[PDB]
Amino acid sequence: GHIYAVGGYDGSPDGHTHLNSVEAYDPERDEWHLVAPMNTRRSGVGVAVLNGHIYAVGGFDGSPDGTDHLNSVERYDPERDEWRLVAPMNTRRSGVGVAVLNGHIYAVGGYDGSGHTHLNSVEAYDPERDEWHLVAPMNTRRSGVGVAVLNGHIYAVGGFDGSPDGTDHLNSVERYDPERDEWRLVAPMNTRRSGVGVAVLNGHIYAVGGYDGSPDGHTHLNSVEAYDPERDEWHLVAPMNTRRSGVGVAVLNGHIYAVGGFDGTDHLNSVERYDPERDEWRLVAPMNTRRSGVGVAVL
C-alpha cells in the first residue's frame, strides 16, 4: 500500500501556508509523488480511509480569502485521482481527530473558532446515507487530539483543553464504546501531549510526538509511548530522531511512519519509520512539501 499526506501547513519562509496539496509515498521506491489537490485547503485536518476512499475531515482554511474552521468533508478516489465533497459535519472542527469503526467515520473533538470553543463533541459519518450524526461527547474537551481504533473502541489521546476552566495540555486518554455510546477514561499517558499523532500497531496504541506546554517547561516532543489495552498501561519506547508536534502518523507493513510536523522552529518535510522489533526509528525519503498539522492515511 501507500501512505498519503493530506493538506497541512507550510510555514517555511517561501511556503504557501495552508495546503490543499496531497502526496503519496511508495515504500518500495522510497518516493513521494504529488497527486490531485483537494477542493479546499486544510491544516489541522483529520484523515481516514473507508471503502477504498480517503476522507479529509474538517481542518482550517486560513488562505488569503477564507479564514475558516471547516465543517466540510471531501473524499478521494485513487482510481480517478479526484476529490469530491460529501455531506458536511454538524460542527466545524480544526485540530480534529478521526478514525474508522464498524464502517463509520468518527470525528472527535477539535476546535471551532468560527465562539472559540475546544470541543468535547463527537459525530459519526454513515457513508451509505451520506450523513453525520452526533453521538456521546467525551469527558474532556480536546483539540489537537490523536484518535485511533483498537479492540472495537475509539481512543481519544491527549490534546488541548483550552477552556476557561482549564487551559491544559492533556495526558488523559478516553475510550469510546459504540455498543453503550459511552466514553470512559483509561490510564493516562506518562507525558502531556497536544498535537500528538497516534496509530495502532501489533495490538498497541502508539502516541508519537506532540507538544507539552505544561507550566513545567514548554516543549516539542520527540518521545513515544505505547498503550497496552489488556493491562491498561503506557510505556515509553524509543524516541524519534526529530521533535514533532502536529505530526501525522500511519502504519504500513509492520512499521509506524511519523510524517512531517513542527519542530520548535521548522515545518518538517522529513519522515521517519519505527521498527517495533529493533525499537528504533529510521529516516526515509522526505516529502516534497513541508507540512505541519498534516493528515495521513494508508491505502
Side-chain angles (χ1 to χ4, degrees), residues 101 106 122 135-139 152-156 174-186:
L101 173 63
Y106 290 78
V122 179
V135 296
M138 293 185 291
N139 293 276
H153 299 66
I154 300 303
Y155 290 77
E174 34 194 322
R175 148 260 272 166
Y176 176 73
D177 169 24
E179 254 298 299
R180 243 162 281 150
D181 187 35
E182 290 171 16
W183 289 90
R184 291 201 244 121
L185 284 132
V186 300

mmCIF file with all atom_site columns, all heavy atoms in Angstrom, residues 101 106 122 135-139 152-156 174-186:
data_model
loop_
_atom_site.group_PDB
_atom_site.id
_atom_site.type_symbol
_atom_site.label_atom_id
_atom_site.label_alt_id
_atom_site.label_comp_id
_atom_site.label_asym_id
_atom_site.label_entity_id
_atom_site.label_seq_id
_atom_site.pdbx_PDB_ins_code
_atom_site.Cartn_x
_atom_site.Cartn_y
_atom_site.Cartn_z
_atom_site.occupancy
_atom_site.B_iso_or_equiv
_atom_site.pdbx_formal_charge
_atom_site.auth_seq_id
_atom_site.auth_comp_id
_atom_site.auth_asym_id
_atom_site.auth_atom_id
_atom_site.pdbx_PDB_model_num
ATOM 1   N N   . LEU A 1 101 ? -14.583 2.987  12.498 1.00 0.00 ? 101 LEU A N   1
ATOM 2   C CA  . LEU A 1 101 ? -15.012 1.894  13.365 1.00 0.00 ? 101 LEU A CA  1
ATOM 3   C C   . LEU A 1 101 ? -16.359 1.396  12.872 1.00 0.00 ? 101 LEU A C   1
ATOM 4   O O   . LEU A 1 101 ? -17.282 2.191  12.679 1.00 0.00 ? 101 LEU A O   1
ATOM 5   C CB  . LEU A 1 101 ? -15.098 2.346  14.837 1.00 0.00 ? 101 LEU A CB  1
ATOM 6   C CG  . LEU A 1 101 ? -15.687 1.393  15.879 1.00 0.00 ? 101 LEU A CG  1
ATOM 7   C CD1 . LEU A 1 101 ? -14.795 0.159  15.960 1.00 0.00 ? 101 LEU A CD1 1
ATOM 8   C CD2 . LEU A 1 101 ? -15.727 2.067  17.249 1.00 0.00 ? 101 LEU A CD2 1
ATOM 9   N N   . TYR A 1 106 ? -15.582 8.417  12.558 1.00 0.00 ? 106 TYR A N   1
ATOM 10  C CA  . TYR A 1 106 ? -15.837 9.261  13.732 1.00 0.00 ? 106 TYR A CA  1
ATOM 11  C C   . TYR A 1 106 ? -14.934 10.482 13.696 1.00 0.00 ? 106 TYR A C   1
ATOM 12  O O   . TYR A 1 106 ? -13.728 10.367 13.454 1.00 0.00 ? 106 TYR A O   1
ATOM 13  C CB  . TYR A 1 106 ? -15.624 8.513  15.048 1.00 0.00 ? 106 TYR A CB  1
ATOM 14  C CG  . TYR A 1 106 ? -16.680 7.468  15.291 1.00 0.00 ? 106 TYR A CG  1
ATOM 15  C CD1 . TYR A 1 106 ? -16.631 6.234  14.637 1.00 0.00 ? 106 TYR A CD1 1
ATOM 16  C CD2 . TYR A 1 106 ? -17.700 7.689  16.219 1.00 0.00 ? 106 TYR A CD2 1
ATOM 17  C CE1 . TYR A 1 106 ? -17.575 5.258  14.904 1.00 0.00 ? 106 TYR A CE1 1
ATOM 18  C CE2 . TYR A 1 106 ? -18.641 6.749  16.453 1.00 0.00 ? 106 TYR A CE2 1
ATOM 19  C CZ  . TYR A 1 106 ? -18.580 5.537  15.797 1.00 0.00 ? 106 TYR A CZ  1
ATOM 20  O OH  . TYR A 1 106 ? -19.550 4.625  16.090 1.00 0.00 ? 106 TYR A OH  1
ATOM 21  N N   . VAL A 1 122 ? -18.537 14.703 19.437 1.00 0.00 ? 122 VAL A N   1
ATOM 22  C CA  . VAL A 1 122 ? -18.101 13.601 18.575 1.00 0.00 ? 122 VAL A CA  1
ATOM 23  C C   . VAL A 1 122 ? -19.241 13.316 17.596 1.00 0.00 ? 122 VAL A C   1
ATOM 24  O O   . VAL A 1 122 ? -20.397 13.297 18.013 1.00 0.00 ? 122 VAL A O   1
ATOM 25  C CB  . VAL A 1 122 ? -17.808 12.323 19.388 1.00 0.00 ? 122 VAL A CB  1
ATOM 26  C CG1 . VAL A 1 122 ? -17.375 11.140 18.450 1.00 0.00 ? 122 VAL A CG1 1
ATOM 27  C CG2 . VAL A 1 122 ? -16.755 12.609 20.474 1.00 0.00 ? 122 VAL A CG2 1
ATOM 28  N N   . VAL A 1 135 ? -22.936 11.809 18.451 1.00 0.00 ? 135 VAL A N   1
ATOM 29  C CA  . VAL A 1 135 ? -23.005 10.712 19.417 1.00 0.00 ? 135 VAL A CA  1
ATOM 30  C C   . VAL A 1 135 ? -22.553 11.249 20.770 1.00 0.00 ? 135 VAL A C   1
ATOM 31  O O   . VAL A 1 135 ? -22.507 12.468 20.964 1.00 0.00 ? 135 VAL A O   1
ATOM 32  C CB  . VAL A 1 135 ? -22.175 9.496  18.969 1.00 0.00 ? 135 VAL A CB  1
ATOM 33  C CG1 . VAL A 1 135 ? -22.764 8.923  17.658 1.00 0.00 ? 135 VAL A CG1 1
ATOM 34  C CG2 . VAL A 1 135 ? -20.674 9.854  18.780 1.00 0.00 ? 135 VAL A CG2 1
ATOM 35  N N   . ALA A 1 136 ? -22.260 10.360 21.725 1.00 0.00 ? 136 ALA A N   1
ATOM 36  C CA  . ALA A 1 136 ? -21.966 10.829 23.073 1.00 0.00 ? 136 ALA A CA  1
ATOM 37  C C   . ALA A 1 136 ? -20.690 11.672 23.083 1.00 0.00 ? 136 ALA A C   1
ATOM 38  O O   . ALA A 1 136 ? -19.702 11.329 22.415 1.00 0.00 ? 136 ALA A O   1
ATOM 39  C CB  . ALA A 1 136 ? -21.820 9.661  24.044 1.00 0.00 ? 136 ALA A CB  1
ATOM 40  N N   . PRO A 1 137 ? -20.680 12.822 23.798 1.00 0.00 ? 137 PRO A N   1
ATOM 41  C CA  . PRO A 1 137 ? -19.483 13.617 23.904 1.00 0.00 ? 137 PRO A CA  1
ATOM 42  C C   . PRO A 1 137 ? -18.440 13.004 24.835 1.00 0.00 ? 137 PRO A C   1
ATOM 43  O O   . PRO A 1 137 ? -18.756 12.175 25.643 1.00 0.00 ? 137 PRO A O   1
ATOM 44  C CB  . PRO A 1 137 ? -19.940 14.940 24.512 1.00 0.00 ? 137 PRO A CB  1
ATOM 45  C CG  . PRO A 1 137 ? -21.136 14.570 25.330 1.00 0.00 ? 137 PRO A CG  1
ATOM 46  C CD  . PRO A 1 137 ? -21.796 13.490 24.509 1.00 0.00 ? 137 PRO A CD  1
ATOM 47  N N   . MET A 1 138 ? -17.213 13.476 24.681 1.00 0.00 ? 138 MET A N   1
ATOM 48  C CA  . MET A 1 138 ? -16.121 12.999 25.554 1.00 0.00 ? 138 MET A CA  1
ATOM 49  C C   . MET A 1 138 ? -16.255 13.630 26.938 1.00 0.00 ? 138 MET A C   1
ATOM 50  O O   . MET A 1 138 ? -16.998 14.597 27.077 1.00 0.00 ? 138 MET A O   1
ATOM 51  C CB  . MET A 1 138 ? -14.776 13.412 24.956 1.00 0.00 ? 138 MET A CB  1
ATOM 52  C CG  . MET A 1 138 ? -14.457 12.709 23.661 1.00 0.00 ? 138 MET A CG  1
ATOM 53  S SD  . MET A 1 138 ? -12.805 13.127 23.060 1.00 0.00 ? 138 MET A SD  1
ATOM 54  C CE  . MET A 1 138 ? -13.040 14.842 22.603 1.00 0.00 ? 138 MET A CE  1
ATOM 55  N N   . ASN A 1 139 ? -15.526 13.089 27.904 1.00 0.00 ? 139 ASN A N   1
ATOM 56  C CA  . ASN A 1 139 ? -15.494 13.667 29.265 1.00 0.00 ? 139 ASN A CA  1
ATOM 57  C C   . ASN A 1 139 ? -14.710 14.976 29.256 1.00 0.00 ? 139 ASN A C   1
ATOM 58  O O   . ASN A 1 139 ? -15.018 15.827 30.078 1.00 0.00 ? 139 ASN A O   1
ATOM 59  C CB  . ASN A 1 139 ? -14.801 12.692 30.210 1.00 0.00 ? 139 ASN A CB  1
ATOM 60  C CG  . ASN A 1 139 ? -15.578 11.412 30.435 1.00 0.00 ? 139 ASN A CG  1
ATOM 61  O OD1 . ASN A 1 139 ? -16.470 11.367 31.276 1.00 0.00 ? 139 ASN A OD1 1
ATOM 62  N ND2 . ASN A 1 139 ? -15.240 10.364 29.702 1.00 0.00 ? 139 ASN A ND2 1
ATOM 63  N N   . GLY A 1 152 ? -12.143 -2.680 19.001 1.00 0.00 ? 152 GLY A N   1
ATOM 64  C CA  . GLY A 1 152 ? -13.536 -2.289 18.933 1.00 0.00 ? 152 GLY A CA  1
ATOM 65  C C   . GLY A 1 152 ? -13.905 -1.001 19.636 1.00 0.00 ? 152 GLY A C   1
ATOM 66  O O   . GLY A 1 152 ? -15.101 -0.683 19.719 1.00 0.00 ? 152 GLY A O   1
ATOM 67  N N   . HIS A 1 153 ? -12.936 -0.244 20.134 1.00 0.00 ? 153 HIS A N   1
ATOM 68  C CA  . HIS A 1 153 ? -13.171 1.042  20.780 1.00 0.00 ? 153 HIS A CA  1
ATOM 69  C C   . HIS A 1 153 ? -12.378 2.127  20.064 1.00 0.00 ? 153 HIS A C   1
ATOM 70  O O   . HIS A 1 153 ? -11.340 1.857  19.455 1.00 0.00 ? 153 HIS A O   1
ATOM 71  C CB  . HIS A 1 153 ? -12.772 0.992  22.257 1.00 0.00 ? 153 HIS A CB  1
ATOM 72  C CG  . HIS A 1 153 ? -13.557 -0.014 23.043 1.00 0.00 ? 153 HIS A CG  1
ATOM 73  N ND1 . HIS A 1 153 ? -13.459 -1.373 22.822 1.00 0.00 ? 153 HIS A ND1 1
ATOM 74  C CD2 . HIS A 1 153 ? -14.480 0.141  24.021 1.00 0.00 ? 153 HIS A CD2 1
ATOM 75  C CE1 . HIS A 1 153 ? -14.292 -2.013 23.628 1.00 0.00 ? 153 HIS A CE1 1
ATOM 76  N NE2 . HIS A 1 153 ? -14.911 -1.117 24.375 1.00 0.00 ? 153 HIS A NE2 1
ATOM 77  N N   . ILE A 1 154 ? -12.893 3.348  20.131 1.00 0.00 ? 154 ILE A N   1
ATOM 78  C CA  . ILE A 1 154 ? -12.167 4.552  19.717 1.00 0.00 ? 154 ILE A CA  1
ATOM 79  C C   . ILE A 1 154 ? -11.392 5.058  20.918 1.00 0.00 ? 154 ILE A C   1
ATOM 80  O O   . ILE A 1 154 ? -11.981 5.203  22.001 1.00 0.00 ? 154 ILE A O   1
ATOM 81  C CB  . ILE A 1 154 ? -13.147 5.653  19.281 1.00 0.00 ? 154 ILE A CB  1
ATOM 82  C CG1 . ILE A 1 154 ? -14.055 5.275  18.115 1.00 0.00 ? 154 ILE A CG1 1
ATOM 83  C CG2 . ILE A 1 154 ? -12.326 6.864  18.850 1.00 0.00 ? 154 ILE A CG2 1
ATOM 84  C CD1 . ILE A 1 154 ? -13.340 4.873  16.935 1.00 0.00 ? 154 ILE A CD1 1
ATOM 85  N N   . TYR A 1 155 ? -10.117 5.407  20.742 1.00 0.00 ? 155 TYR A N   1
ATOM 86  C CA  . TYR A 1 155 ? -9.343  6.060  21.804 1.00 0.00 ? 155 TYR A CA  1
ATOM 87  C C   . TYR A 1 155 ? -9.041  7.505  21.422 1.00 0.00 ? 155 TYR A C   1
ATOM 88  O O   . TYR A 1 155 ? -8.565  7.783  20.312 1.00 0.00 ? 155 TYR A O   1
ATOM 89  C CB  . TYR A 1 155 ? -8.036  5.307  22.097 1.00 0.00 ? 155 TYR A CB  1
ATOM 90  C CG  . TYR A 1 155 ? -8.267  3.979  22.764 1.00 0.00 ? 155 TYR A CG  1
ATOM 91  C CD1 . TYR A 1 155 ? -8.700  2.869  22.034 1.00 0.00 ? 155 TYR A CD1 1
ATOM 92  C CD2 . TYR A 1 155 ? -8.049  3.821  24.111 1.00 0.00 ? 155 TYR A CD2 1
ATOM 93  C CE1 . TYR A 1 155 ? -8.926  1.652  22.637 1.00 0.00 ? 155 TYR A CE1 1
ATOM 94  C CE2 . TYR A 1 155 ? -8.261  2.590  24.730 1.00 0.00 ? 155 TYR A CE2 1
ATOM 95  C CZ  . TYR A 1 155 ? -8.684  1.521  23.998 1.00 0.00 ? 155 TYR A CZ  1
ATOM 96  O OH  . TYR A 1 155 ? -8.877  0.323  24.635 1.00 0.00 ? 155 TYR A OH  1
ATOM 97  N N   . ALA A 1 156 ? -9.400  8.429  22.304 1.00 0.00 ? 156 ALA A N   1
ATOM 98  C CA  . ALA A 1 156 ? -9.031  9.839  22.187 1.00 0.00 ? 156 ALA A CA  1
ATOM 99  C C   . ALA A 1 156 ? -7.837  10.093 23.108 1.00 0.00 ? 156 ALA A C   1
ATOM 100 O O   . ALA A 1 156 ? -7.928  9.875  24.324 1.00 0.00 ? 156 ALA A O   1
ATOM 101 C CB  . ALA A 1 156 ? -10.219 10.732 22.552 1.00 0.00 ? 156 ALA A CB  1
ATOM 102 N N   . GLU A 1 174 ? -9.246  8.656  26.781 1.00 0.00 ? 174 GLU A N   1
ATOM 103 C CA  . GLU A 1 174 ? -10.563 8.059  27.000 1.00 0.00 ? 174 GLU A CA  1
ATOM 104 C C   . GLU A 1 174 ? -10.937 7.160  25.837 1.00 0.00 ? 174 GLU A C   1
ATOM 105 O O   . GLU A 1 174 ? -10.394 7.277  24.725 1.00 0.00 ? 174 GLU A O   1
ATOM 106 C CB  . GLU A 1 174 ? -11.677 9.093  27.234 1.00 0.00 ? 174 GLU A CB  1
ATOM 107 C CG  . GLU A 1 174 ? -11.619 10.417 26.519 1.00 0.00 ? 174 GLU A CG  1
ATOM 108 C CD  . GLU A 1 174 ? -12.619 11.414 27.150 1.00 0.00 ? 174 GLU A CD  1
ATOM 109 O OE1 . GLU A 1 174 ? -13.727 10.986 27.527 1.00 0.00 ? 174 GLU A OE1 1
ATOM 110 O OE2 . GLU A 1 174 ? -12.253 12.600 27.339 1.00 0.00 ? 174 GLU A OE2 1
ATOM 111 N N   . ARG A 1 175 ? -11.828 6.208  26.132 1.00 0.00 ? 175 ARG A N   1
ATOM 112 C CA  . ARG A 1 175 ? -12.157 5.144  25.190 1.00 0.00 ? 175 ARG A CA  1
ATOM 113 C C   . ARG A 1 175 ? -13.655 5.125  24.963 1.00 0.00 ? 175 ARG A C   1
ATOM 114 O O   . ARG A 1 175 ? -14.439 5.266  25.912 1.00 0.00 ? 175 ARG A O   1
ATOM 115 C CB  . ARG A 1 175 ? -11.645 3.791  25.690 1.00 0.00 ? 175 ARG A CB  1
ATOM 116 C CG  . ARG A 1 175 ? -12.462 2.576  25.325 1.00 0.00 ? 175 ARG A CG  1
ATOM 117 C CD  . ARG A 1 175 ? -13.358 2.115  26.479 1.00 0.00 ? 175 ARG A CD  1
ATOM 118 N NE  . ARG A 1 175 ? -12.666 1.187  27.367 1.00 0.00 ? 175 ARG A NE  1
ATOM 119 C CZ  . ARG A 1 175 ? -13.104 0.855  28.572 1.00 0.00 ? 175 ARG A CZ  1
ATOM 120 N NH1 . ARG A 1 175 ? -14.231 1.352  29.054 1.00 0.00 ? 175 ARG A NH1 1
ATOM 121 N NH2 . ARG A 1 175 ? -12.395 0.005  29.309 1.00 0.00 ? 175 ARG A NH2 1
ATOM 122 N N   . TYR A 1 176 ? -14.052 4.989  23.691 1.00 0.00 ? 176 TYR A N   1
ATOM 123 C CA  . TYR A 1 176 ? -15.454 5.058  23.307 1.00 0.00 ? 176 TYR A CA  1
ATOM 124 C C   . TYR A 1 176 ? -15.980 3.655  23.045 1.00 0.00 ? 176 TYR A C   1
ATOM 125 O O   . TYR A 1 176 ? -15.450 2.934  22.191 1.00 0.00 ? 176 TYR A O   1
ATOM 126 C CB  . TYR A 1 176 ? -15.641 5.935  22.066 1.00 0.00 ? 176 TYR A CB  1
ATOM 127 C CG  . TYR A 1 176 ? -17.071 5.959  21.558 1.00 0.00 ? 176 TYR A CG  1
ATOM 128 C CD1 . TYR A 1 176 ? -18.055 6.665  22.247 1.00 0.00 ? 176 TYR A CD1 1
ATOM 129 C CD2 . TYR A 1 176 ? -17.429 5.305  20.365 1.00 0.00 ? 176 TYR A CD2 1
ATOM 130 C CE1 . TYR A 1 176 ? -19.359 6.704  21.784 1.00 0.00 ? 176 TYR A CE1 1
ATOM 131 C CE2 . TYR A 1 176 ? -18.740 5.346  19.889 1.00 0.00 ? 176 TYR A CE2 1
ATOM 132 C CZ  . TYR A 1 176 ? -19.697 6.044  20.616 1.00 0.00 ? 176 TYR A CZ  1
ATOM 133 O OH  . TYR A 1 176 ? -21.013 6.092  20.176 1.00 0.00 ? 176 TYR A OH  1
ATOM 134 N N   . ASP A 1 177 ? -17.041 3.283  23.753 1.00 0.00 ? 177 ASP A N   1
ATOM 135 C CA  . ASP A 1 177 ? -17.740 2.032  23.484 1.00 0.00 ? 177 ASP A CA  1
ATOM 136 C C   . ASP A 1 177 ? -18.925 2.278  22.553 1.00 0.00 ? 177 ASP A C   1
ATOM 137 O O   . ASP A 1 177 ? -19.907 2.910  22.972 1.00 0.00 ? 177 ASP A O   1
ATOM 138 C CB  . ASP A 1 177 ? -18.220 1.418  24.801 1.00 0.00 ? 177 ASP A CB  1
ATOM 139 C CG  . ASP A 1 177 ? -19.177 0.248  24.610 1.00 0.00 ? 177 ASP A CG  1
ATOM 140 O OD1 . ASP A 1 177 ? -19.164 -0.409 23.544 1.00 0.00 ? 177 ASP A OD1 1
ATOM 141 O OD2 . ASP A 1 177 ? -19.923 -0.041 25.577 1.00 0.00 ? 177 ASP A OD2 1
ATOM 142 N N   . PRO A 1 178 ? -18.903 1.806  21.304 1.00 0.00 ? 178 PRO A N   1
ATOM 143 C CA  . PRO A 1 178 ? -20.050 2.064  20.416 1.00 0.00 ? 178 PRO A CA  1
ATOM 144 C C   . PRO A 1 178 ? -21.319 1.351  20.851 1.00 0.00 ? 178 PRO A C   1
ATOM 145 O O   . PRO A 1 178 ? -22.418 1.807  20.513 1.00 0.00 ? 178 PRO A O   1
ATOM 146 C CB  . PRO A 1 178 ? -19.560 1.554  19.058 1.00 0.00 ? 178 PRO A CB  1
ATOM 147 C CG  . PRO A 1 178 ? -18.555 0.463  19.437 1.00 0.00 ? 178 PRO A CG  1
ATOM 148 C CD  . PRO A 1 178 ? -17.843 1.029  20.638 1.00 0.00 ? 178 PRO A CD  1
ATOM 149 N N   . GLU A 1 179 ? -21.202 0.258  21.606 1.00 0.00 ? 179 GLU A N   1
ATOM 150 C CA  . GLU A 1 179 ? -22.379 -0.502 22.000 1.00 0.00 ? 179 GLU A CA  1
ATOM 151 C C   . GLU A 1 179 ? -23.237 0.298  22.974 1.00 0.00 ? 179 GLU A C   1
ATOM 152 O O   . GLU A 1 179 ? -24.457 0.405  22.800 1.00 0.00 ? 179 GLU A O   1
ATOM 153 C CB  . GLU A 1 179 ? -21.945 -1.831 22.623 1.00 0.00 ? 179 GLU A CB  1
ATOM 154 C CG  . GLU A 1 179 ? -22.159 -3.078 21.762 1.00 0.00 ? 179 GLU A CG  1
ATOM 155 C CD  . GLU A 1 179 ? -23.621 -3.341 21.422 1.00 0.00 ? 179 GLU A CD  1
ATOM 156 O OE1 . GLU A 1 179 ? -24.429 -3.553 22.354 1.00 0.00 ? 179 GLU A OE1 1
ATOM 157 O OE2 . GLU A 1 179 ? -23.960 -3.342 20.215 1.00 0.00 ? 179 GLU A OE2 1
ATOM 158 N N   . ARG A 1 180 ? -22.619 0.878  24.001 1.00 0.00 ? 180 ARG A N   1
ATOM 159 C CA  . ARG A 1 180 ? -23.347 1.643  25.001 1.00 0.00 ? 180 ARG A CA  1
ATOM 160 C C   . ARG A 1 180 ? -23.324 3.145  24.730 1.00 0.00 ? 180 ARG A C   1
ATOM 161 O O   . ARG A 1 180 ? -23.946 3.908  25.485 1.00 0.00 ? 180 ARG A O   1
ATOM 162 C CB  . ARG A 1 180 ? -22.779 1.366  26.400 1.00 0.00 ? 180 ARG A CB  1
ATOM 163 C CG  . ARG A 1 180 ? -23.748 0.714  27.379 1.00 0.00 ? 180 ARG A CG  1
ATOM 164 C CD  . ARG A 1 180 ? -22.990 0.085  28.561 1.00 0.00 ? 180 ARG A CD  1
ATOM 165 N NE  . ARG A 1 180 ? -22.389 -1.207 28.242 1.00 0.00 ? 180 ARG A NE  1
ATOM 166 C CZ  . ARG A 1 180 ? -21.284 -1.684 28.805 1.00 0.00 ? 180 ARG A CZ  1
ATOM 167 N NH1 . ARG A 1 180 ? -20.606 -0.985 29.705 1.00 0.00 ? 180 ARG A NH1 1
ATOM 168 N NH2 . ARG A 1 180 ? -20.843 -2.892 28.455 1.00 0.00 ? 180 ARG A NH2 1
ATOM 169 N N   . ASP A 1 181 ? -22.623 3.592  23.681 1.00 0.00 ? 181 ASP A N   1
ATOM 170 C CA  . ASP A 1 181 ? -22.463 5.015  23.366 1.00 0.00 ? 181 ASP A CA  1
ATOM 171 C C   . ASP A 1 181 ? -21.924 5.804  24.568 1.00 0.00 ? 181 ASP A C   1
ATOM 172 O O   . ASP A 1 181 ? -22.502 6.789  25.022 1.00 0.00 ? 181 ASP A O   1
ATOM 173 C CB  . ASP A 1 181 ? -23.781 5.608  22.839 1.00 0.00 ? 181 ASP A CB  1
ATOM 174 C CG  . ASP A 1 181 ? -23.625 7.043  22.342 1.00 0.00 ? 181 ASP A CG  1
ATOM 175 O OD1 . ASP A 1 181 ? -22.563 7.372  21.778 1.00 0.00 ? 181 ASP A OD1 1
ATOM 176 O OD2 . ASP A 1 181 ? -24.558 7.858  22.527 1.00 0.00 ? 181 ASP A OD2 1
ATOM 177 N N   . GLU A 1 182 ? -20.769 5.372  25.066 1.00 0.00 ? 182 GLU A N   1
ATOM 178 C CA  . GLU A 1 182 ? -20.202 5.931  26.279 1.00 0.00 ? 182 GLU A CA  1
ATOM 179 C C   . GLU A 1 182 ? -18.709 6.120  26.114 1.00 0.00 ? 182 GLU A C   1
ATOM 180 O O   . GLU A 1 182 ? -18.053 5.278  25.508 1.00 0.00 ? 182 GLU A O   1
ATOM 181 C CB  . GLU A 1 182 ? -20.422 4.993  27.483 1.00 0.00 ? 182 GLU A CB  1
ATOM 182 C CG  . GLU A 1 182 ? -21.840 4.893  27.956 1.00 0.00 ? 182 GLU A CG  1
ATOM 183 C CD  . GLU A 1 182 ? -22.019 3.797  28.997 1.00 0.00 ? 182 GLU A CD  1
ATOM 184 O OE1 . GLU A 1 182 ? -21.001 3.336  29.569 1.00 0.00 ? 182 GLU A OE1 1
ATOM 185 O OE2 . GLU A 1 182 ? -23.181 3.405  29.248 1.00 0.00 ? 182 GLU A OE2 1
ATOM 186 N N   . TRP A 1 183 ? -18.182 7.192  26.701 1.00 0.00 ? 183 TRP A N   1
ATOM 187 C CA  . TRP A 1 183 ? -16.749 7.414  26.874 1.00 0.00 ? 183 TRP A CA  1
ATOM 188 C C   . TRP A 1 183 ? -16.321 7.167  28.334 1.00 0.00 ? 183 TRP A C   1
ATOM 189 O O   . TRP A 1 183 ? -16.984 7.596  29.285 1.00 0.00 ? 183 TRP A O   1
ATOM 190 C CB  . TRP A 1 183 ? -16.391 8.835  26.482 1.00 0.00 ? 183 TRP A CB  1
ATOM 191 C CG  . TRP A 1 183 ? -16.465 9.136  24.973 1.00 0.00 ? 183 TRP A CG  1
ATOM 192 C CD1 . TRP A 1 183 ? -17.555 9.584  24.294 1.00 0.00 ? 183 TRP A CD1 1
ATOM 193 C CD2 . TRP A 1 183 ? -15.414 9.015  24.015 1.00 0.00 ? 183 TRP A CD2 1
ATOM 194 N NE1 . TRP A 1 183 ? -17.240 9.779  22.956 1.00 0.00 ? 183 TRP A NE1 1
ATOM 195 C CE2 . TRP A 1 183 ? -15.937 9.424  22.760 1.00 0.00 ? 183 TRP A CE2 1
ATOM 196 C CE3 . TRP A 1 183 ? -14.080 8.615  24.083 1.00 0.00 ? 183 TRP A CE3 1
ATOM 197 C CZ2 . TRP A 1 183 ? -15.175 9.448  21.611 1.00 0.00 ? 183 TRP A CZ2 1
ATOM 198 C CZ3 . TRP A 1 183 ? -13.321 8.640  22.946 1.00 0.00 ? 183 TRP A CZ3 1
ATOM 199 C CH2 . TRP A 1 183 ? -13.860 9.044  21.708 1.00 0.00 ? 183 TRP A CH2 1
ATOM 200 N N   . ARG A 1 184 ? -15.202 6.482  28.507 1.00 0.00 ? 184 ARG A N   1
ATOM 201 C CA  . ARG A 1 184 ? -14.624 6.236  29.826 1.00 0.00 ? 184 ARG A CA  1
ATOM 202 C C   . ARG A 1 184 ? -13.138 6.578  29.795 1.00 0.00 ? 184 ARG A C   1
ATOM 203 O O   . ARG A 1 184 ? -12.430 6.245  28.830 1.00 0.00 ? 184 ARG A O   1
ATOM 204 C CB  . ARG A 1 184 ? -14.834 4.798  30.267 1.00 0.00 ? 184 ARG A CB  1
ATOM 205 C CG  . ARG A 1 184 ? -16.307 4.552  30.552 1.00 0.00 ? 184 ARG A CG  1
ATOM 206 C CD  . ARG A 1 184 ? -16.651 3.387  31.449 1.00 0.00 ? 184 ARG A CD  1
ATOM 207 N NE  . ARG A 1 184 ? -17.411 2.317  30.810 1.00 0.00 ? 184 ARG A NE  1
ATOM 208 C CZ  . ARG A 1 184 ? -17.007 1.054  30.722 1.00 0.00 ? 184 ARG A CZ  1
ATOM 209 N NH1 . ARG A 1 184 ? -15.892 0.683  31.351 1.00 0.00 ? 184 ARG A NH1 1
ATOM 210 N NH2 . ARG A 1 184 ? -17.717 0.142  30.071 1.00 0.00 ? 184 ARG A NH2 1
ATOM 211 N N   . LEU A 1 185 ? -12.660 7.256  30.834 1.00 0.00 ? 185 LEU A N   1
ATOM 212 C CA  . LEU A 1 185 ? -11.213 7.461  30.937 1.00 0.00 ? 185 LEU A CA  1
ATOM 213 C C   . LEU A 1 185 ? -10.503 6.147  31.192 1.00 0.00 ? 185 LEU A C   1
ATOM 214 O O   . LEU A 1 185 ? -11.003 5.265  31.899 1.00 0.00 ? 185 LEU A O   1
ATOM 215 C CB  . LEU A 1 185 ? -10.872 8.474  32.038 1.00 0.00 ? 185 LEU A CB  1
ATOM 216 C CG  . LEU A 1 185 ? -11.169 9.899  31.586 1.00 0.00 ? 185 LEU A CG  1
ATOM 217 C CD1 . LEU A 1 185 ? -11.948 10.686 32.589 1.00 0.00 ? 185 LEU A CD1 1
ATOM 218 C CD2 . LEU A 1 185 ? -9.788  10.605 31.295 1.00 0.00 ? 185 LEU A CD2 1
ATOM 219 N N   . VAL A 1 186 ? -9.302  6.032  30.626 1.00 0.00 ? 186 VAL A N   1
ATOM 220 C CA  . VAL A 1 186 ? -8.445  4.876  30.879 1.00 0.00 ? 186 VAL A CA  1
ATOM 221 C C   . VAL A 1 186 ? -7.129  5.408  31.449 1.00 0.00 ? 186 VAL A C   1
ATOM 222 O O   . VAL A 1 186 ? -7.084  6.516  32.016 1.00 0.00 ? 186 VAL A O   1
ATOM 223 C CB  . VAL A 1 186 ? -8.246  3.997  29.624 1.00 0.00 ? 186 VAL A CB  1
ATOM 224 C CG1 . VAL A 1 186 ? -9.644  3.436  29.091 1.00 0.00 ? 186 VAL A CG1 1
ATOM 225 C CG2 . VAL A 1 186 ? -7.468  4.755  28.506 1.00 0.00 ? 186 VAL A CG2 1
#
